[PDB]
């Protein structure tokens, strides 16, 4: 009918239905939300600074961070003493090591935030980081995993949060075939929590297991020995394609200098006990002997160069690309996010978020009239086709079917998946249970777990209960996890668990007010005591923590990380 184009015009124009046009009006509601978000990011963006240069914050105005006041002078004294030795006490080794003008990720940050409670009731162990810093680094045109042991040995070298971080880094590198670089500085072991860190599985032995399984798959790895690595820490220099020992302060020992005493205590110099022995000794241990920190870093870079990965990365990830920005300003991402601590769940939207994040502000909807709860479709993220699952409302059987169908197509055509978690939302109606809802949930989870597609999840907010099993979860092998500040990970019910557990707990009929004070308030305190900031990341649950505004850049880092894969 008076309409005869050739699909384009209708396409390739600034007027295709594919795009999205949710324009906000900045009203009170927007302000209430936008403002809060701002109230939810300032310190997130801040604590980072405090742990960075940990314990030395000369401004002394860090009231925006709820961190307790710490003895700045002690940390400055320790740093001065350490830097007088001739080694750089910072993450400086990293940004010296990575090529200028390139990107970085800082995979796990704020690790071990106020984790352990000391004997002093008001004092926690001052683990500003997990004892290491981990991030994806691009060296000499080669993408690599960077792990650096911090010089914080006051509490002890490695904790249940340190070895877990190291093992997570090793698993990520092995999955993605990114070579690792380890910067080694250790105080040995922790002889206090040794039962928690040495024996059992997924412990310090699995590091040695991984450093051999990698070299089986011919994924070369490199370690730099800046200081002592004793107590089983001396095997990494031994198990290494290339290793670096600094001329003066680089030391490697299987038995400590105190250990020779009380067992043939003919004590001699710490150099002769296994440290950097530049005298043409009989031992052929340690590939590189470098006179200075810069010399060692330079030789590490030079060894990284001769791996032939530059051609493969350059072919797989195009270095010269034209950035395509979204149609709407990314600062608006905080506004559509609702507020917090609201008796009844507030309202929420997804279209706006996806239209703000994706390229050209576009989307490819599958069936949206049907199973209106769940959202699935294709997209574009900086030159790469992506699939997104974002959740909105209370799940039905049909939503699970649609999810299974989408995941089937994505696995069929080798399209990566992105997850945006939300509430559990399993209806409890009797008719729904009689309609085989459990079978359809199984249909969804089977497809989720069976998918060989790379998978990344990011918390939008309100991910509580067994609903994440429908979409995705840490136990379903997501190659990366990141989080927004307004996140709560809890039991099958965030608010309802309060009501349900109020009924069935040794409660007399009378004393109703005192009981709800003792029951409902207490369970609310329990189920929102956990949050994005503490229960997560600090314990390497969903290790990555980010800002809602800069999500697309992070996801693009992740996707470039997962295309060197076999």
């Amino acid at each position: 009918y008076a309409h005869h184009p050739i699909d384009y015009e209708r396409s390739t124009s600034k007027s295709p239905n594919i795009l999205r046009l949710p324009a906000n009006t900045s009203d009170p509601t927007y302000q209430e939300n936008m403002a809060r978000m701002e109230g939810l990011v300032e310190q997130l963006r801040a604590r980072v600074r405090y742990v960075q240069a940990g314990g030395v914050v000369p401004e002394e105005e860090a009231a925006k961070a709820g961190v307790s006041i710490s003895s700045i002078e002690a940390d400055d004294r320790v740093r001065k003493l350490h830097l007088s030795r001739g080694k750089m006490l910072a993450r400086d080794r990293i940004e010296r090591l990575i090529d200028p003008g390139t990107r970085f990720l800082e995979l796990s940050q704020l690790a071990g935030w106020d984790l352990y409670w000391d004997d002093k009731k008001k004092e926690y162990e001052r683990c500003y980081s997990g004892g290491i810093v981990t991030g994806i680094g691009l060296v000499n045109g080669v993408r690599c995993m960077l792990v650096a042991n911090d010089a914080t040995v006051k509490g002890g070298t490695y904790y249940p949060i340190t070895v877990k971080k190291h093992l997570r880094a090793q698993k990520i590198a092995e999955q993605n075939h990114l070579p690792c670089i380890y910067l080694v500085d250790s105080g040995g072991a922790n002889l206090s929590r040794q039962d928690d860190v040495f024996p059992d599985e997924q412990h310090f032995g699995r590091i040695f297991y991984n450093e051999a399984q990698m070299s089986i798959k011919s994924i070369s790895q490199i370690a730099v020995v800046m200081g002592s690595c004793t107590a089983g820490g001396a095997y990494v220099p031994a198990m290494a394609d290339e290793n670096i020992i600094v001329a003066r302060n680089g030391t490697i020992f299987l038995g400590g200098p105190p250990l020779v005493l009380a067992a043939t205590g003919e004590k001699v110099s710490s150099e002769e006990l296994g440290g950097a022995d530049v005298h043409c000794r009989i031992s052929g241990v340690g590939d590189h002997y470098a006179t200075d920190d810069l010399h060692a870093l330079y030789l590490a870079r030079r060894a990284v160069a001769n791996l032939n990965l530059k051609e493969h990365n350059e072919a797989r990830n195009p270095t010269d690309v034209k950035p395509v920005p979204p149609l709407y300003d990314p600062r608006e991402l905080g506004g559509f996010i609702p507020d917090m601590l609201s008796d009844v769940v507030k309202s929420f939207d997804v279209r706006a978020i996806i239209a703000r994040i994706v390229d050209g502000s576009r989307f490819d909807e599958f069936k949206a009239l049907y199973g209106n709860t769940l959202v699935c479709g294709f997209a574009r993220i900086e030159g790469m086709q992506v699939g997104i699952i974002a959740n909105q409302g209370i799940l039905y059987s049909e939503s699970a079917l649609k999810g299974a169908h989408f995941i089937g197509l994505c696995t069929q055509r080798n399209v990566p998946l992105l997850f945006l978690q939300n509430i559990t939302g399993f209806m409890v109606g009797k008719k729904y249970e009689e309609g085989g809802i459990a079978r359809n949930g199984a249909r969804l989870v089977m497809a989720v777990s069976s998918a060989p597609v790379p998978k990344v999840t990011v918390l939008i907010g309100g991910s509580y209960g067994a609903g994440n099993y429908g979409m995705c979860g840490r136990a379903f092998e997501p190659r990366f996890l990141f989080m927004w500040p307004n996140a709560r990970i809890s039991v099958m019910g965030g608010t309802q668990a309060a009501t349900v557990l109020t009924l069935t707990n040794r409660n007399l009929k009378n004393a109703s007010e005192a009981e709800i004070a003792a029951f409902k308030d207490k369970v609310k305190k329990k189920y929102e005591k956990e949050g994005s900031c503490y229960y997560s990341t600090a314990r390497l649950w969903d290790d990555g923590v980010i800002a809602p505004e800069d999500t697309r850049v992070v996801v693009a880092e992740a996707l470039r990380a997962t295309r060197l894969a076999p």
Binding site: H3, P5, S13, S15, N17, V344, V345, S347, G393, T495
Partner: protein
């Protein structure tokens, strides 16, 4: 100049026909000769031929490498000249991209066309500026620098300058729903308890705003209807409603 209409045609008209070469013109000289002026050359059916051809070629490989079976090619362009749509049809006979014909306003002829270097692959707002040559059968030849875009085709040559607007064909391609929407709209589940309705009755709803918000165990679950037309409310805030109740009728604006 190409890109914006100018009064340059007016000034030339002010200089040719008015006999002001004598030198006597009054302050109100412009007022009386307004009928004579404001006149421009008539777009001949040939001008459409070069203008139409440029838009294709200056956009793609139309007529380039084209091939069918036991038939011949055909491609058409629609021009929105003045307030009347204009259709031009171009086709070829033989194995010749060179030999081309045309039929606009029931006028038919033949010509050949030889292009120039291909430029502006990015085809941005400026699009492609290329020189063209056209050998019509009668015997003439022409040279035309055409900067063509989706909005219009501009041709500059010995004829002058002419921009031909392309017939616009856009209208919410997708969301074209004329459904009545009589009943059973934004129905709420059993618990009901509607409240906090933020939409005025009898106001157009094309974008999917929250028409009604119903709460089922702290489930705001906003309906977010996208049916176009004004929405008429049959319920009030705070009124508990049954399952799948007709909370409102979203009907086309009549």
């Amino acid at each position: 100049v190409a890109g914006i209409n100018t009064n340059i045609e007016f000034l030339k008209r002010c200089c040719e026909t008015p006999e002001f070469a004598r030198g006597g013109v009054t302050t109100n000289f412009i007022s009386e000769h307004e009928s004579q002026l404001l006149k421009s050359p008539v777009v001949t059916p040939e001008v459409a031929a070069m203008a139409a051809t440029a838009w294709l070629l200056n956009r793609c490989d139309n007529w380039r490498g084209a091939f069918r079976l036991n038939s011949d090619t055909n491609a058409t362009v629609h021009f929105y000249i003045d307030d009347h749509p204009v259709e031009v049809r171009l086709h070829t006979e033989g194995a010749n991209y060179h030999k081309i014909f045309f039929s606009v306003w029931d006028h038919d002829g033949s010509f050949e066309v030889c292009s120039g270097p291909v430029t502006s692959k990015h085809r941005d707002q400026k699009s492609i500026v290329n020189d063209f040559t056209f050998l019509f059968e009668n015997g003439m030849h022409h040279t035309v620098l055409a900067v063509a875009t989706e909005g219009d085709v501009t041709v500059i040559g010995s004829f002058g300058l002419h921009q031909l607007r392309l017939l616009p064909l856009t209208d919410g391609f997708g969301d074209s729903s004329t459904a009545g929407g009589t009943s059973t709209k934004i129905v709420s589940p059993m618990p009901g308890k509607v409240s906090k309705l933020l939409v005025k009755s009898g106001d157009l709803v094309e974008k999917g705003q929250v028409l009604v918000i119903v709460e089922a165990m702290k489930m705001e679950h906003p309906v977010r209807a996208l049916q176009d037309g004004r929405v008429s409310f049959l319920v009030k805030e705070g009124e508990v409603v049954g399952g799948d109740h007709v909370l409102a009728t979203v009907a086309e604006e009549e």
